[PDB]
């Protein structure tokens, strides 16, 4: 992820020219290996028709070119990139919002299951480190990045989130499946025996419970849901052929072609298709952001921060409901219990 | 389900080149058939138009392409497709959305349903089955796969997922219309049976199963609307008959002619119409992904594993309710008892 | 409704092909007399072009015609006719969506309403009663179908849905406003009723009743709703306006002229405005796409089965509440007791 | 707001040209002034380019007209009017959704807020009564017509929302912002109270109506939210800058030129821009559908009924709470005890 | 935020006409600049055109105004503006909708946190003073003008929204991350020890309680969300380049060329290029407006008015549950205990 949240926060007259000069995150970075070979292979087929062919093979070149430039429109570009880019960004988006946070929970946590001994304390830990399990196990399935952090369960176990209890439990169950719903089952048996034990004071509290701890796995496996049903296939490869064949007919009908045949619109030799390259630029910059968006659990400079939320959630977390639990100051009255640096339109 | 979505995780230079050599799921696989009737019906009339019509003929089928190629444009093609397109799209999503998933009830059941004795088991299992026995009537209702797989009742029962007396319960049933639903009511009843002995502690752990209970009932009757409420058959209609109505004045105006008759833009006789096919290959591949889009539980390649996640569904849910309750590991210290391999923008 | 959800569960090569046979809403049903008053307008001016009008008045006419056909490209008629269409859709889906089903409520019922004697079963199938005869009232107000089947209260007392003394309670009321509320205020009361007596064993059942009960009422007063506020009828004239002209401009302006003269792109005289026929049938074809979709509660094909939805919730209600009440079969081991005909991406 | 949605049940061969004969809420009782200034301008620089222009001038003024019909195309009008349109039409449905409505309150309220006598009868009213006054008071502030109504707290007093004990308490709550929230907040208080003294059976019921009670304050913020932030301002200017400046350009360059002079596309002067008035009336009618529906609590005849709508909730809750509470018919055996005028795709 | 609401209730003659005089929140204000340092590049250009080059390098600009009059239409300006404009507005109004408001949890605490004592004062005025600080802190974190107000903690403490003890309790907490949260953990702590004491009087209240604090939260962190995850830099840099080559090739080929050398299309000096200024107005006032929504919490005009919000916010909160609390006029009989200034579509 490249914030640039605070460079935009207001409308200036400078106002999207300074973030031209940003490299990490950028369309440059993206594209300039593809804008170079395009180029290339422009410069290619423009030397060789300056250079090699006969004046009868220019002749037919230059019919060919002219061909392809008035035709190459047929291909609907524009059409199939904007209905896959929008499709892209939207399940970019959603699946941002699907990434499981334990605020929720701790919340509840902290405000249900009680006791200041070492087994309130477990309790609430282990309750916390249930939920970031699963999130762990879920997000290494499907994020490149946490995979390479948690390569085996064995670094989950080195990284605390699992005990080597509960990792003999874990590989002991027999299931072909992921089994990143397991710490979740976890959580729903040790709410209840909480709540069985006194810990939990009610049912409400552990009903409360119970459907956060529900949220949570459904964020979890919405993550699985994105993960497993990708974009269609079918949808891919149609726009990347768009894009690929436009672009090869542009690579033909862009060609300068030379101004003494007095062909219409062919009179200025400018031995570099500056409009060309802009457009180029533009819709394979469009393709490639969906390349960098479709999977943004990779590890592009946008795709999420996944083991840094990790890492938060789990301090966050813990901080919570061990550290900050039944630890409130003193009831005070505050400044104004005696009371800077629109109404409506009808009134 | 044709999954890609490791192989996209990072947008790299070779991006989604490399995902235009798969056959499973692709637009290959969906239109080599029609790409190759388009193409043997162009060379059909194109080689009418050069080896056996007369000079006069010729004439008039020279007028006649020009015409076509003119006023074939006059199609809103893409206008209906595009509308067409993204209303499967958003009912594809949706329908695959709408799948009842077992993960919430299996926890809650776990969480809920208590006793360790085989009673327990039976109230537990029983549950999470009458769930998964739903999922099942109305997916074989709704998915041609699951039908192949369960083509009768009996197949459901000697699946295990009705039991004999069930069945006499069952079709002894007088409705004339789907029972899908029947399960949840028994579910509902065997819920306040339970709740009624004791095996569910709190009137609060049963409206939190009640819940979760409805909410799968909703995503099965969800599905069973989605069955029922097709995409309107005059959009469908509409939108074959602009394909086929344009790409048949196509395969008239887009004919190579004779270059000797000096027409404008026909001087290059290609003998191919490379466009025009490319063109073909992206409108009617577009249509063709919603044609097996539109509806995703069919047997294509890219529709979804609705067998696999029945199996799926039902392991898991044996496996949370059944072996794992109960099962917990004792509450141990964590690694970080006593303490790899962002704040805000206007900070 | 017209289902052909089966005949499109794969892309086969003769995919939508064969659904181009069906008459029942179809477009060729709903759209053939409109096409032959424009072919034979159409026509009409044609002939009089060709035979009565004199040589002056000709030349005059294909000014005319050449005028009209370049400049009704100023009437944005894909521009409106695309807002309006997708706000029809979204508009029509949502109504789908707003039909008020009984399964959630009759599910809580038969869980929260209990005894196996007459009063029982009389609390049970008066509770939903109560909320088929909101769905009812409702139906008859916002459907022409429903209202046909109950063109007075009468024939909904005759037909079950209402007791004698309930209308007479129910025509007593003094409100001049729709009373299809008046059941759902009858529901709460009849549940605070039951959960005195006992029937209902405690408050939170009565909650999930009454929070059940709120989602149905909200679903009926949602179809009261869309079927007061209509889609604004600024829009409706603005593209019944757009098409009408645009149509009228094309009956002028593609009339073809004596190839004689010379005129650009007249030089094929075919007689017959094949382009622009099809023009008219995809974008008129549109506009009766939106007016039969606009109110899916008439008497189209492809409008909702109103009257099959009243009589199928009905059924299912009573035979949930009242014959399935406490009639589960005694709990069985499973076939699976002792244990046909993907992981993740970064693993 | 102007229903026709009985007119449209079924698409009809005169489906919707029988609705371009209806005035209220019209595009023609909208647009008629701005059509006939338009044609005004037209005439009266038509007449002078015929009359008054010199030779010289007339060439000049000729070229100018040429010139701003090639280039007034530059403007992108349909760009910026789409966008805007669709903002608009969101947030008006959005808006009417918001509206606050007291039938979930008033079943709840009548369901679970007892007794016979007389202060059963004053708690339940008092109840409704303050919701209603809750959503008078936002009203009143975002809906011009409400306002006209209830100019002044007195009337609200007079009109028996509020009584004037409560005026006293409301007018001296020290408070610079809208108190619209207030009776929200009575009405915690009251149901506490109401709870406290038995009223209000259970807690569970207690809870059930303050989260009722707050989707319904959650409503009333809403209508504020929508009130208070806007159609961003520079949308809306830019938006009626493109469509100005794009007509005064079309007031230039539409006007039919001296056809002697033989410019192409200028040859048949039919001195009524019949193509230009009808796209004025597409545009311009498309902007003023905006403008009606930007703010729809104004008085448009399309904007919507407010006071109607505060009449009918006053009654209908009065009428549901007070008359009806307790007030069932006997619980009587109904018509089907001992039982007129689709299963599935892959079955 | 510029509020227009109350000068557009009507849809007038005038219309939007009056909103154009209007300099606060306007377009003119955000572009005359950049407007401005356009026309000035173009004046540069025609005059060197004009005054400083020779003939033969006038022929050679010509023909590269003819070029690039040409072929800047290859830069798809619309299309990527028209994608980022709305991914822009739709993230406004989801922002809007994410400012955390506390009047649903206001209405809770006055509704269940009982006492007139000093100790209930106290409970509920801490319980509403940990939302508002909660919503400081995540303001301060993600606005500039909040920030600008609040620069320190110490600045936080000195506006009474947090005291000093929870100071030191709050900077003693060992957290590299935001710690908006804390006041949530504060909340639910204090919910619990209110409950525990008896000030909450039941079990289900103090779930309201939860729950509507977990709504506040929820809010919180998803204004986190909002400010972390921005709007991907590669899109900002992708239409920010494309309106700026697009104009740079405006500059160069919407310049006047001499009449004299009988250019098409180049016939009229008018020496200022009136129609490209309205399309530069049009398009980067689009950007403009993109530019100023992305970050709504700026100091823009139309930027939200966080610290108004803020102030609002904690005076009515107090006001509810202090003032307000157990402060009800006496139940009196309203004006029509005894009893001004549409039915359906199928009756
Ligand atoms: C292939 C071509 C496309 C790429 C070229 C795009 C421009 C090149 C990058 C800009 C310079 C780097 C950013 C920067 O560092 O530059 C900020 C500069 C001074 O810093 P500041 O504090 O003003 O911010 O200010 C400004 O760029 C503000 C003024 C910018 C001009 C606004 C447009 C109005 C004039 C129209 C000209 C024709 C095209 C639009
Ligand atoms: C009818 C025409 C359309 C269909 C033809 C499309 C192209 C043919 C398929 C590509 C080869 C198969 C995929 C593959 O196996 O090929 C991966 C290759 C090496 O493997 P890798 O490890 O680099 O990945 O790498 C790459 O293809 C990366 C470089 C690709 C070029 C990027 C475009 C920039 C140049 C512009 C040229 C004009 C059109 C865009
Ligand atoms: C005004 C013009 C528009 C209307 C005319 C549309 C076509 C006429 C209706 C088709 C016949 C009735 C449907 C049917 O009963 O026909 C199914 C047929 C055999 O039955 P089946 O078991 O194969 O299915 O199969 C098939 O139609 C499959 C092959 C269809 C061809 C696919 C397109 C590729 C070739 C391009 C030709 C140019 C236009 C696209
Ligand atoms: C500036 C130009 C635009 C404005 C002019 C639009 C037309 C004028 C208004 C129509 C008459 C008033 C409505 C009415 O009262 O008229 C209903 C009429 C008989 O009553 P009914 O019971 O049949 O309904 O029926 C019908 O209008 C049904 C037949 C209508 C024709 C359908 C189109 C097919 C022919 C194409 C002609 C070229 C343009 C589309
Ligand atoms: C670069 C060009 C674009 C910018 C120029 C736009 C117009 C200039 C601003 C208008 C005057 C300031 C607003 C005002 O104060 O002016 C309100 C005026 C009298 O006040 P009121 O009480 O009537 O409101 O009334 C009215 O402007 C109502 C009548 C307005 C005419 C409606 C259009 C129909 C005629 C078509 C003409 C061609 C273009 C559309
Ligand atoms: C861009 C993409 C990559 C490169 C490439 O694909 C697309 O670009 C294509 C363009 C082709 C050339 C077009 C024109 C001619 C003239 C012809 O002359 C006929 C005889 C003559 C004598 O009188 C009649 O007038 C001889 C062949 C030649 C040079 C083609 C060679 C192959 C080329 C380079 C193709 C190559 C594979
Ligand atoms: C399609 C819709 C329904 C029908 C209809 O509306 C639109 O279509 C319109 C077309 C009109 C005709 C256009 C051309 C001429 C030539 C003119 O000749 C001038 C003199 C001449 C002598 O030298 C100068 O050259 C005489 C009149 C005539 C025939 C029009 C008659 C009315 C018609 C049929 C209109 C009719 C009401
Ligand atoms: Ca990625
Ligand atoms: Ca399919
Ligand atoms: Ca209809
Ligand atoms: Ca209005
Ligand atoms: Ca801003
Ligand atoms: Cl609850």
Known sequence: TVTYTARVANARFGGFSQLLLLWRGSIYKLLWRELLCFLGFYMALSA??????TEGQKRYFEKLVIYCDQYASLIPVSFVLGFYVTLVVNRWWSQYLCMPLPDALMCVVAGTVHGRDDR??????????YAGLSAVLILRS????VFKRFPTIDHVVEAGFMTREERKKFENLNSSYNK????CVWFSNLAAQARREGRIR???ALKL?????????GKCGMLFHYDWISVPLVYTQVVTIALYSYFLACLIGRQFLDPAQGYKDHDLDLCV??????????YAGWLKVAEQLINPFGEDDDDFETNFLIDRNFQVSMLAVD???????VLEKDLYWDAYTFQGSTF
């Open 48 to 53: 060789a028709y300056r250079f090699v062919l």
């Open 120 to 129: 309130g304390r477990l309790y609430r830990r282990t309750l916390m480190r």
């Open 142 to 145: 499907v994020s490149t990045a």
């Open 180 to 183: 990143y719903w397991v710490p």
């Open 202 to 204: 009610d049912n409400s």
């Open 209 to 217: 419970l119970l459907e956060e701890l529900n949220v949570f796995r």
């Open 273 to 282: 298709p500056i409009f060309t390259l802009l457009q180029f630029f533009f």
């Open 323 to 329: 550290e900050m639990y039944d630890d409130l100051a």
